């Protein structure tokens, strides 16, 4: 059960990381992400 909780937490961490990254380029004025940018999954092997 701790595996399910832990993997859900890792998913939420990845979502938070993506949200912050999006916040940055949205505030900078870019409507979309940098050309060719793709957020890597750093919290999953």
């Amino acid at each position: 059960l701790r595996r399910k909780v832990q993997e859900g937490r890792l998913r939420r961490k990845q979502i938070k990381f993506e949200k912050d990254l999006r916040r940055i380029w949205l505030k900078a004025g870019l409507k979309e992400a940098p050309e060719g940018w793709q957020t890597p999954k750093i919290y999953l092997r």
Partner: protein, 161 residues
């Protein structure tokens, strides 16, 4: 480059009449028939003659830097073959740090000798980083994205103006 194996030992290079001896004696008194430490001594002597103003003064900071650089080269040569020698890896890393400290002192005190040492030994002096912190995955990815976002912002501003 190493000294040629035919070169005489440091202790048998000024003996009078050393050039009037048999070829066998020359071989016996050459680097070919000795261990690596005599070759390192010859390297140190060559560097001292090429670099320092007074080659006899082994007490100066430049002489110490030359000696430690020769030792560092020896450790690197050892570790090229002995890749799992942790003790010698530690010795190499400590020696590099000590040479950096001596180079910093030399730069602060005598800039001309510092330049001469850096040129002669092929050393590229580098300034230390200001902050020591882990570059974990999140920070690396975030910094990459920030650099990129700055680049498209610059492109967009150039297009605007």
């Amino acid at each position: 480059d190493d000294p040629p194996p035919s070169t005489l030992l440091k202790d048998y290079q000024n003996v009078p009449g050393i050039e009037k001896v048999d070829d066998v004696v020359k071989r016996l008194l050459s680097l070919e028939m000795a261990n690596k430490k005599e070759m390192l001594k010859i390297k140190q002597e060559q560097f001292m003659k090429k670099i320092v103003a007074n080659p006899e003064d082994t007490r100066s900071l430049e002489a110490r830097i030359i000696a430690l650089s020769v030792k560092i080269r020896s450790y690197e040569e050892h570790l090229e073959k002995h890749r799992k020698d942790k003790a010698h890896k530690r010795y190499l890393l400590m020696s590099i740090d000590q040479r950096k400290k001596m180079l910093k002192n030399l730069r602060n005190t005598n800039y001309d000798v510092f330049e001469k040492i850096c040129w002669g030994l092929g050393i590229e002096y580098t300034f230390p980083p200001l902050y020591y912190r882990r570059a974990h995955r999140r920070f690396v990815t975030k910094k990459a994205l920030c650099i990129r976002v700055f680049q498209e912002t610059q492109k967009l501003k150039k297009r605007r103006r």
